[PDB]
Amino acid sequence: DLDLAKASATDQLKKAKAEAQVIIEQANKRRSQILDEAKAEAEQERTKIVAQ
Amino acid sequence: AQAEIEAERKRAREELRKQVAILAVAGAEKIIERSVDEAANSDIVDKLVAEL
Numbered sequence A: 001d002l003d004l005a006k007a008s009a010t011d012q013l014k015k016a017k018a019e020a021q022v023i024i025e026q027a028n029k030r031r032s033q034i035l036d037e038a039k040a041e042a043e044q045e046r047t048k049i050v051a052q
Numbered sequence B: 001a002q003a004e005i006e007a008e009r010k011r012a013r014e015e016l017r018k019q020v021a022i023l024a025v026a027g028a029e030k031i032i033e034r035s036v037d038e039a040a041n042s043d044i045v046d047k048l049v050a051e052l
Helices: A001-050 B003-035 B038-052
Strands: none
Touching: A001 B003
C-alpha cells in the first residue's frame, strides 16, 4: 500500500507534466495564429491604402 | 505605411522640378540665340576685359 500510493502520486505528476506542456503549446499554437492574423490584416490594409 | 507615402511625396515633387528646369533652359537657348545683338555681344567683351 505504501509503494502503490507513491506509484499513484508519480503517475499523477506525469499527467500533471503532460498537462503543463500541452497548455503551453495550445498557447503557442494560439500565438502563431493571432500574429498571422495581425500580419494578414496589416498587409491587406497597407496595400489598398498605397493604391489609393 | 503612412510614413511611406510622405516619403513618396518628396519623390513626386523632385521629379517635376527636373522636368521644368531642363525644358526651361531648352527654351532659353532658342530665346537667347534668336535675341543675340552685336551691341550686347560687344558689352559681354567690354565686361570681361574690364575684370580680366
